Amino acid sequence: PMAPYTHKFLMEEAWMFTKISDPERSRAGEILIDFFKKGNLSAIRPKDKP
Amino acid sequence: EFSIREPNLEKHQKYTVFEAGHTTVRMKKGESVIGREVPLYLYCRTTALSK
Amino acid sequence: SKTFAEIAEAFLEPEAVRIAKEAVEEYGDHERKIIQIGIHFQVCCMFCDEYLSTNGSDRFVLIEGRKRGTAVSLQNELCKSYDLEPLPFLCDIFDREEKQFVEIGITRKADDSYFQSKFGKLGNSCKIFVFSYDGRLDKNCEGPMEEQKLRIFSFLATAADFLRKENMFNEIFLPDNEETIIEMKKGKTFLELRDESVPLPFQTYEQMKDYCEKFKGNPRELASKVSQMQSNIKLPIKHYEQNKFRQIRLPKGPMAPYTHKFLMEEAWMFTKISDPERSRAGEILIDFFKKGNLSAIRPKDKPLQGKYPIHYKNLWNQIKAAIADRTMVINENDHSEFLGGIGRASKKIPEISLTQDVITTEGLKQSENKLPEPRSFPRWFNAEWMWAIKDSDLTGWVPMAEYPPADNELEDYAEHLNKTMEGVLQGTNCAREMGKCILTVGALMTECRLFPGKIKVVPIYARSKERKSMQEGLPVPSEMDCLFGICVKSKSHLNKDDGMYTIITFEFSIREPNLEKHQKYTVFEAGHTTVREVPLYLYCRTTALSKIKNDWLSKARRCFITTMDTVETICLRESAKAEENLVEKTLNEKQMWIGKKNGELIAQPLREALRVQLVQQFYFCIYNDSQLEGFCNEQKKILMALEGDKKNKSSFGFNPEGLLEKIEECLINNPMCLFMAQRLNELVIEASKRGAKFFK
Amino acid sequence: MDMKKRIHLELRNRTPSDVKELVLDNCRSYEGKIEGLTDEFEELEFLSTINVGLASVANLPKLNKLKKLELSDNRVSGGLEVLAEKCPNLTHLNLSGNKIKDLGTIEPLKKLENLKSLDLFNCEVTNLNDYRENVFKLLPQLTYLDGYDRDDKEAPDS
Amino acid sequence: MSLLLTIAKEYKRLCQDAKAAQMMTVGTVSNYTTFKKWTTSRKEKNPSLRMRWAMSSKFPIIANKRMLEEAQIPKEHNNVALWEDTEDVSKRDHVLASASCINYWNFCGPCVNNSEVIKEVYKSRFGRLERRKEIMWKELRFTLVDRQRRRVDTQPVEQRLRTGEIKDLQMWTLFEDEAPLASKFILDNYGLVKEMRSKFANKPLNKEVVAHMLEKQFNPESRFLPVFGAIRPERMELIHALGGETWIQEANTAGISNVDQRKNDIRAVCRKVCLAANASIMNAKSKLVEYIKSTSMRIGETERKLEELILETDDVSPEVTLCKSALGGQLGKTLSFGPMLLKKISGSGVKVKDTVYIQGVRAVQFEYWSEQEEFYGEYKSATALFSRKERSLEWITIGGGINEDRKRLLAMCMIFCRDGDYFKDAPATITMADLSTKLGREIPYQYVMMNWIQKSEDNLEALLYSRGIVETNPGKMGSSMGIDGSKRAIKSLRAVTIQSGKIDMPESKEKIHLELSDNLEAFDSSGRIVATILDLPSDKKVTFQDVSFQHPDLAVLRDEKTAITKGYEALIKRLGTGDNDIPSLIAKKDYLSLYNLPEVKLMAPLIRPNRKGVYSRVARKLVSTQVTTGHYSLHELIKVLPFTYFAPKQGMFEGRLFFSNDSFVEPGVNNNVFSWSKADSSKIYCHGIAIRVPLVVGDEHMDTSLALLEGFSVCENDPRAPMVTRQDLIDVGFGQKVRLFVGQGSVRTFKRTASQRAASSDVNKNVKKIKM
RNA sequence: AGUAGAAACAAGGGCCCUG
């Protein structure tokens, strides 16, 4: 069989949400919370069957 | 991880995949911007690391 | 459910439920009427609908839910204030924009009867509105507000659907004014009887009802009668330690002979190799026939013992002929007719065609049932028990399915233990008898189903596999088809369960018989056979079977289940007390008493004692009858008393002699019962050396 | 709902021979197969079938006067050869949202000489290298692509 | 079709007879059920026997004939028979056959296009399988087990329902033409029905089987079984393969089925609202009921009403009990005294008065029960069986596994029985302040001593000392308990017994309708208290997810977002029936009269004033485009209308519509301010809050009569109006009448005019106007 | 002949069918 993907992350098939950078909130714990506030993540509700 | 490209069985073997609603794509339109909705996928995987 | 209130709470508001409940309690009526009232009340509510007048005040004022006296007080108050005439009867609601009371009605019948009665009772005094659960309305004035009508009809429709679903949409729960008295239609004959079935002191149900509804407790007379009855009884109590158990008295007479249809120990068989293509019986019976040994047989007219040898001889010759014809069928001659009980069924004689003269000619008395006769202790049972414990030179006698996969340690353990037990058991002799019975009974059942009214020929055979030596020599041991004898059926017209279809059994042996044991058989001297050369005998007899027996004999793989249960229980119980895997040790080390030899006890590991329990279960499956049933049902008391003796529990009883009598009553001409009873006596004897409660 | 009832509803007593446009979006078609269409529709010049669980266009009947089509949100794959025979006078097409795996599937469309614009968005084909140019070299008759002509000339409204 | 004509001919032929006519004329349709029993009645004693006796035959099976001809099923394929032309005696339209034919069908028979629908039919069992596959087994060990018997659930099930709610659901998902009137459970749970219908539609299926499977999919199989370890349905379904009396197959099964989280969330919500209502002094009852009905929560995908879930669960907690009592929900006969659990086995009694002096001389009344009674008790990992006798703890036995739990259970038991001298003479430490009445609400000395124990361990030790202590007699050494909770000692407490092995929990399939007071204390046809607000944790802060506290007091939002939400609510309330409403106007294509509604006029001040004209233009544009044709989405007009009040202007529309509070909505994509989905088309999410849109009209998405039922109602029957189907029902005019067939053997008359009012208020109010 | 039990079978219905 063919060799599968091995790297940890995704390069070409990836995707990203965007937002403006605030130097007063330039940390992961803050960036994640801010991204979560607008409620675009909460909409992510994967169905049961994959 | 997030993705907007359905997978293939060979390259994506260690990955467990789902379908998480939809999302939006933004592109120029003359002098304005528009938004075209597309599906959305979620790629699940486990792995180890070290120092 | 469980009460009408909970039901009403399903589609009503609990408030109106409580209201109607308090109301029926006020009038003290049957609580089955909670429903109607609540509905009426709720309607009134959904009528008011927070409607308002020009003056910004409430338009409608409820009167229904209130008490009767208070309701009349308010009614008169309003008739006075607004200067209206007092009504004779009470109402449900009153309006202000028109200043005239309003009455609401409801019914299920699609007719004006309710509205006609109400209008006659009240003429045109006030406004009356009667709705129907099926969309009808009858009134004496202009129609109500639209919203009111919609909300009322919708509510009523839902309620009616619910009721119809609950079967309560009847006059009982939804009666009119008149049909409010439901009662059992007590007739005349029923009363005449009821007044005749009364106890003695009373003579009419009324007296009994008055005595029971008012009965009061008088403990003193009760205690006095108790003591009196306690004195005229004198219940005996017998602690076993003082009153010991005598031995059991077996019957006396001749010995109990062989009863099983097939031979086990004295059986001789011819073997061959099995080809997968030819696997049916009608085929193997020919394969064995070609080599010439089955045809080499040629008995003589002089039997060692038995009766009717000529019939048996002719039947054997006919069997050989039929086999040669490649058709397992036999013709109806005098011989077969005699052995198959063809025409020996009684002839019927109606009484309408009978006179006192007909009875005198040939005595027609009532049949004198000849119950079985007693027997003695059999001395050949231990021999069979000891022979059925040893190997048979082969294995795989009893077919078994495959083992599924495994994922956890549990299934691995189960598979390992099951493999050990199956490999140990499949090599014995009892196993080959089980497989023989299985296959032969299957063939006979198939034949009885397909070819009734026709005498057939079925073999007595089995399939096995030679044991596995080391890799040396010829590997992959082969299979084997073995043949012990021949069987024959006779017109198994099983019109009904429990029926009887006589079979015949031609078996092969190399051991001369005994009159006591092989009493029913009829042996012949056939000739010689190899191994060197040795004489040959031919055991022949007659018997019968049924659907029930065939089915239960074919399902003879339960003994494995029981034995596995017992063993796994012991091993797991020993392993848990120490919290460690003690199974192989428990199988190879733990010793179990088996028997006595030279007045001493004998023991061997459980791994080898399993065979004893297996044979016990097999015999239970074989010799099962009512006698053995009663015995095994009545012996538990003795074992429980024994256990009580082992633990110093001062047991006692009321009448052990009766127990011994009941036990010894069901011991007749059934070898298994006699054997187990003698062994139980020996048990209590051997334990008397270590325990009390037993006499010698 | 169902394309049958949807259609019978859109046809407010109107014959299927005098209409110039039709829409069936947000419907359902068993087995992803058309149901209720015939050659009776002659004057029809526009069509819209979106998000109806469709998978093949085999059943589609002949429609000459048709000049615009929309099949987005479905999962059509490898049924493009039929379009030429049924609707050769077609000019505008849309397939964004369907299962298009390779340029081989899109070759038949060259025979639609009347074709002007095509719309492929969110398909796998778009994720290749030199796809717009290779497509243009395949379909020279086609001018617009996903709303952009060579040199990225935004197309007008209509 | 021709089949229809054949059915009609058969009906005619059958009516030609006299008996059939009499029976089809007399009575109602229910008689059918009865007729279903008098026919085809035949059983057998030992089917195993007769099965071996029959399968031994040639043609033991029956089968259809035309199905075989159409399927081209031959006879004597390869010299082996399959069937022969005959007629069974019972069916008269079936033919004998053999088992081999079935294999023939399975191998060279007719094939269907697809069969994955099965996975939905039997979802419960595929779920069992998957749950199994996601397990990580472990070693096996041998030892003895303390298996306690108790009533539990073995089938994991989401949205557990009743039977009356299920019978309608089956009909509305499979047989809609034969459907009855819409019940409340449907109108409330619309998306659920839509989902269950999307799968079993346009498919070749046997429907009875599907209905049975759905019943199983909504039934938690309750059993009285021995159990060990944790209690979760995910385990009980395979308990047989985890451990027995002597063995245990260790395995981790914690991360599956996400059940108990829902229950703990529910109980947390109940506690919160109970405390809230307790903040009141005279209407905590109505306050609590309002908080209940003014609240909802999400389950998986769907949003359910709280009062609906509470009446379906069986969590015996002092919180759920109160709620189920307020709503008149019946429940079991289970008690609660603080954290512990209790259940009465036998005995009786009646209240009695007594007093105690707190400090010096301070008389305080405390009650007890004057009789002998027996009680089972269950604390964390500890069981007990005790008896009370006239203000004393007669005896008690325990089968727990911990010393701390043992001591706490014993102390709470002693309290529950008012045993000891403390109830005769309280300690000095307590005072009148600690007595009761945080703000006026009294407290019986019982819970007083309770909190006094929970405060310090030394109070507990002293309380235990209040129980008689003696020297451990010989032999009873094993059945003894010290002060620390040791299975043996030289000196132990009085009238106590210990043992290894929990106690078998009793059982009773009984229900009771209880009530409560204005102080939140429930009573059960007696002076006994089953629950209160003092037996629950004091308070704690939690962040509830996927919840809707649509109530002023139970809200944290500001006046701005609340004003927006209320404007949207009013604008939706204008979504009803009658002219001057938006549906009639759409039907008439009067897209202009919408701009002049009063509701948009009240929400206009909230619009960004510097760009209100541009947005207005766009909104009006969209509206006309949707209205002129008929292809509209109701979830977008309700969103953009508030902007059409002002006058159009010129400018560049970036793509967003802002209010005056820096909160926008976008036309086509869901955001935090306005969201919805095609799955649940009966909800609108604004600022997290949910709003229930009525079902009066159906757009392109909604594809059945289900979306129109809240626009119809029953009215007086009129034989003049026409009789129509359930599909043409959409082409009627608001305010018109029409006859119709409903369910079975029932015809009625409907009118497309709604009635938003309910019965709750119209009854409660009119009642309160009677207690004066 | 035989079975088994504390009574029943050892074909039954109309030359034809049947468990």
Swiss-Prot record, chain A:
Q: What's the PTM story here? A: Phosphorylated on serines and threonines by host kinases, including human casein kinase II.
Localization (cell): Host cytoplasm; Host nucleus
Endpoints of the signal sequence: none
Per the entry, what this protein does is: Plays an essential role in viral RNA transcription and replication by forming the heterotrimeric polymerase complex together with PB1 and PB2 subunits. The complex transcribes viral mRNAs by using a unique mechanism called cap-snatching. It consists in the hijacking and cleavage of host capped pre-mRNAs. These short capped RNAs are then used as primers for viral mRNAs. The PB2 subunit is responsible for the binding of the 5' cap of cellular pre-mRNAs which are subsequently cleaved after 10-13 nucleotides by the PA subunit that carries the endonuclease activity.
The UniProt family comment states: Belongs to the influenza viruses PA family.
Please describe the quaternary structure of this protein. Influenza RNA polymerase is composed of three subunits: PB1, PB2 and PA. Interacts (via C-terminus) with PB1 (via N-terminus).
Q: What is this protein called?
A: Polymerase acidic protein
* Origin organism lineage: Viruses, Riboviria, Orthornavirae, Negarnaviricota, Polyploviricotina
Q: Which residues of the full protein are shown?
A: 255 to 304 of 709
Swiss-Prot record, chain E:
Looking up InterPro entries in the UniProt record yields: Flu_PB2_2nd, Flu_PB2_6th, Flu_PB2_C, Flu_PB2_CAP-bd, Flu_PB2_middle, Flu_PB2_N, INV_PB2, PB2_helical
Q: Name the keywords, alphabetized.
A: Cap snatching, Eukaryotic host gene expression shutoff by virus, Eukaryotic host transcription shutoff by virus, Host gene expression shutoff by virus, Host nucleus, Host-virus interaction, Inhibition of host RNA polymerase II by virus, mRNA capping, mRNA processing, Viral transcription, Virion
Subunit field text = Influenza RNA polymerase is composed of three subunits: PB1, PB2 and PA. Interacts (via N-terminus) with PB1 (via C-terminus). Interacts with nucleoprotein NP (via N-terminus). Interacts with host ANP32A (via C-terminus); this interaction promotes viral RNA synthesis.
The identity of this protein, by name, is Polymerase basic protein 2
Where is it located? Virion; Host nucleus
For this chain, the family text in UniProt reads: Belongs to the influenza viruses PB2 family.
For this UniProt entry, which residues form the secretion signal?
Answer: none
One GO process term, biological-process aspect:
DNA-templated transcription
A GO molecular function annotation here is: RNA binding
- The primary location reported for this protein is virion
This protein's GO CC annotations? host cell nucleus; virion component
Lineage, top ranks:
Viruses, Riboviria, Orthornavirae, Negarnaviricota, Polyploviricotina
* Physiological role: Plays an essential role in transcription initiation and cap-stealing mechanism, in which cellular capped pre-mRNAs are used to generate primers for viral transcription. Recognizes and binds a wide range of cap structures of target pre-RNAs which are subsequently cleaved after 10-13 nucleotides by the viral protein PA. Plays a role in the initiation of the viral genome replication and modulates the activity of the ribonucleoprotein (RNP) complex.
